[PDB]
Design an enzyme around this catalytic site. Sequence first.
Site, PDB file in Angstrom:
ATOM      1  N   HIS A  38       0.815  -0.950  -0.030  1.00  0.00           N
ATOM      2  CA  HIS A  38      -0.159   0.034   0.132  1.00  0.00           C
ATOM      3  C   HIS A  38       0.953   1.121   0.282  1.00  0.00           C
ATOM      4  O   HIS A  38       1.117   1.773   1.264  1.00  0.00           O
ATOM      5  CB  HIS A  38      -1.081   0.141   0.934  1.00  0.00           C
ATOM      6  CG  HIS A  38      -2.093   1.379   1.276  1.00  0.00           C
ATOM      7  ND1 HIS A  38      -3.461   0.513   0.353  1.00  0.00           N
ATOM      8  CD2 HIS A  38      -2.214   2.115   1.423  1.00  0.00           C
ATOM      9  CE1 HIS A  38      -4.155   1.350   0.767  1.00  0.00           C
ATOM     10  NE2 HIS A  38      -3.466   2.448   0.530  1.00  0.00           N
ATOM     11  N   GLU A  58      -1.589   3.217  -5.007  1.00  0.00           N
ATOM     12  CA  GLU A  58      -1.795   4.274  -5.479  1.00  0.00           C
ATOM     13  C   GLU A  58      -0.604   4.974  -5.859  1.00  0.00           C
ATOM     14  O   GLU A  58      -0.384   6.436  -5.268  1.00  0.00           O
ATOM     15  CB  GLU A  58      -2.350   4.701  -5.261  1.00  0.00           C
ATOM     16  CG  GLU A  58      -4.225   4.796  -4.469  1.00  0.00           C
ATOM     17  CD  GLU A  58      -4.998   5.147  -4.359  1.00  0.00           C
ATOM     18  OE1 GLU A  58      -4.467   6.438  -3.853  1.00  0.00           O
ATOM     19  OE2 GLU A  58      -6.702   5.370  -4.220  1.00  0.00           O
ATOM     20  N   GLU A  62      -9.754  -0.669  -4.582  1.00  0.00           N
ATOM     21  CA  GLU A  62     -10.666   0.674  -3.596  1.00  0.00           C
ATOM     22  C   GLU A  62     -11.355   1.121  -3.631  1.00  0.00           C
ATOM     23  O   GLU A  62     -11.053   1.841  -4.626  1.00  0.00           O
ATOM     24  CB  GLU A  62      -9.222   1.067  -3.020  1.00  0.00           C
ATOM     25  CG  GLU A  62      -9.573   1.640  -1.414  1.00  0.00           C
ATOM     26  CD  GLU A  62      -8.204   2.678  -1.126  1.00  0.00           C
ATOM     27  OE1 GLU A  62      -6.606   1.945  -1.053  1.00  0.00           O
ATOM     28  OE2 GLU A  62      -7.629   4.350  -0.954  1.00  0.00           O
TER      29      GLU A  62
HETATM   30  O1  LIG Z   1      -5.980   7.189  11.639  1.00  0.00           O
HETATM   31  C1  LIG Z   1      -5.189   6.354  10.681  1.00  0.00           C
HETATM   32  C2  LIG Z   1      -3.991   7.735  10.080  1.00  0.00           C
HETATM   33  O2  LIG Z   1      -5.115   7.802   9.099  1.00  0.00           O
HETATM   34  C3  LIG Z   1      -4.415   8.640   8.100  1.00  0.00           C
HETATM   35  O3  LIG Z   1      -4.897   9.436   6.917  1.00  0.00           O
HETATM   36  C4  LIG Z   1      -5.786   8.373   6.511  1.00  0.00           C
HETATM   37  C5  LIG Z   1      -7.114   8.041   5.862  1.00  0.00           C
HETATM   38  O4  LIG Z   1      -7.590   7.712   7.126  1.00  0.00           O
HETATM   39  C6  LIG Z   1      -7.790   7.510   4.781  1.00  0.00           C
HETATM   40  O5  LIG Z   1      -8.659   6.713   4.565  1.00  0.00           O
HETATM   41  C7  LIG Z   1      -6.661   7.562   3.448  1.00  0.00           C
HETATM   42  O6  LIG Z   1      -7.152   6.150   2.910  1.00  0.00           O
HETATM   43  C8  LIG Z   1      -6.870   6.277   1.951  1.00  0.00           C
HETATM   44  C9  LIG Z   1      -5.457   5.122   0.894  1.00  0.00           C
HETATM   45  O7  LIG Z   1      -4.474   5.477   1.325  1.00  0.00           O
HETATM   46  C10 LIG Z   1      -5.550   5.685  -0.011  1.00  0.00           C
HETATM   47  O8  LIG Z   1      -5.306   4.207  -0.915  1.00  0.00           O
HETATM   48  C11 LIG Z   1      -6.764   6.488  -0.830  1.00  0.00           C
HETATM   49  O9  LIG Z   1      -7.669   6.395  -2.034  1.00  0.00           O
HETATM   50  O10 LIG Z   1      -6.967   7.730   0.126  1.00  0.00           O
HETATM   51  C12 LIG Z   1      -7.821   7.052   0.759  1.00  0.00           C
HETATM   52  C13 LIG Z   1      -8.249   8.615   1.648  1.00  0.00           C
HETATM   53  O11 LIG Z   1      -7.695   9.676   1.391  1.00  0.00           O
HETATM   54  O12 LIG Z   1      -5.364   7.705   4.060  1.00  0.00           O
HETATM   55  C14 LIG Z   1      -5.705   8.489   5.088  1.00  0.00           C
HETATM   56  C15 LIG Z   1      -3.651   8.599   4.977  1.00  0.00           C
HETATM   57  O13 LIG Z   1      -3.303   7.706   5.130  1.00  0.00           O
HETATM   58  C16 LIG Z   1      -4.229  10.958   8.836  1.00  0.00           C
HETATM   59  O14 LIG Z   1      -3.451  11.027   7.646  1.00  0.00           O
HETATM   60  C17 LIG Z   1      -2.437  10.297   9.358  1.00  0.00           C
HETATM   61  O15 LIG Z   1      -2.380  10.783  10.350  1.00  0.00           O
HETATM   62  C18 LIG Z   1      -3.354   8.834  10.962  1.00  0.00           C
HETATM   63  O16 LIG Z   1      -2.628   8.565  12.208  1.00  0.00           O
END
Ligand SMILES: OC[C@H]1O[C@@H](O[C@H]2[C@H](O)[C@@H](O)[C@H](O[C@H]3[C@H](O)[C@@H](O)[C@@H](O)O[C@@H]3CO)O[C@@H]2CO)[C@H](O)[C@@H](O)[C@@H]1O
Length: 300
Positions: free
Chosen positions: A98, A136, A225
């Site tokens: 990831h 991604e 996703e």
């Molecule tokens: O609380 C844990 C951690 O979260 C971090 O933010 C996350 C969002 O919570 C999560 O939804 C988002 O997921 C992304 C996914 O990883 C990607 O592949 C993608 O498509 O977009 C999703 C939503 O944008 O990722 C973020 C970042 O990892 C906080 O930034 C961090 O501070 C916190 O500890």
Amino acid sequence: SVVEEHGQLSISNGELVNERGEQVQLKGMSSHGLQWYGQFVNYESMKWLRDDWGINVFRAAMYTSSGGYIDDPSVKEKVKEAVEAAIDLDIYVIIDWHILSDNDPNIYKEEAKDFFDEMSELYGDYPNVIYEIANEPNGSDVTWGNQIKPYAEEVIPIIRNNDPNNIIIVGTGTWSQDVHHAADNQLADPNVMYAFHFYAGTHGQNLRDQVDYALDQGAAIFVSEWGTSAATGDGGVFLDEAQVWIDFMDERNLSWANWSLTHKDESSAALMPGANPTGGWTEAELSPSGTFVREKIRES
Ligand SMILES: OC[C@H]1O[C@@H](O[C@H]2[C@H](O)[C@@H](O)[C@H](O[C@H]3[C@H](O)[C@@H](O)[C@@H](O)O[C@@H]3CO)O[C@@H]2CO)[C@H](O)[C@@H](O)[C@@H]1O
């Protein structure tokens, strides 16, 4: 008995099919980052998802950076736990390297090759496994032809030495949205799919047309996703657009995994703050997003 029934998956004429050549569609949940919300990934919660929600795939989101595998490799054992639970529950499982803030998959390509060597050596003779080698890819300087395709052409051979034909999902540019460039310059492996990811907060009509363009080039697409929220994973729930995409994916026979199984206070999270990490959730313990996703999979 999902895996016993469908068994070995493969790609035929751009479509995911089972071992008897019939189209199959996987629908399930992705974990959130295993370094943060790993408690929700276990045999009991996965069995609850299988039995109560109807999932037939589970995605283990192993962040590489952001406190993930590169900083603390112990998280690879939670991926092994998820894979073994999927094998015991007879459902499919996606092993997701990831990448995100490490936006070019070449940054940790040596570590990726070693990790996929280990995972394919351990689990390569099970039909449940699907490898997702770069969640991604993102950034203007990360393109399919220059960065992503060559990365895949280094990691796929490693997997194929141990596991000749389980499905491999390869990320695409611009946070796995640029399936048009991948579809015009496809990889050679016959059992590859390209990732396409969406968020219902974004108006998606052109993105649906772009998925169709890629499908028309004979590329297979896995929606590994997607969320009901905005692209940040929060900012409200957008169920009208989410339903449009659900219907689109059913018409095109696209497999998918929803983001994500956690109680974090963000719109895309499926669970509310008091949800038990081992399953058994009541209606009150599912968020607006989780309630909808559960309904979509049960309806299936
Ligand atoms: O609380 C844990 C951690 O979260 C971090 O933010 C996350 C969002 O919570 C999560 O939804 C988002 O997921 C992304 C996914 O990883 C990607 O592949 C993608 O498509 O977009 C999703 C939503 O944008 O990722 C973020 C970042 O990892 C906080 O930034 C961090 O501070 C916190 O500890």
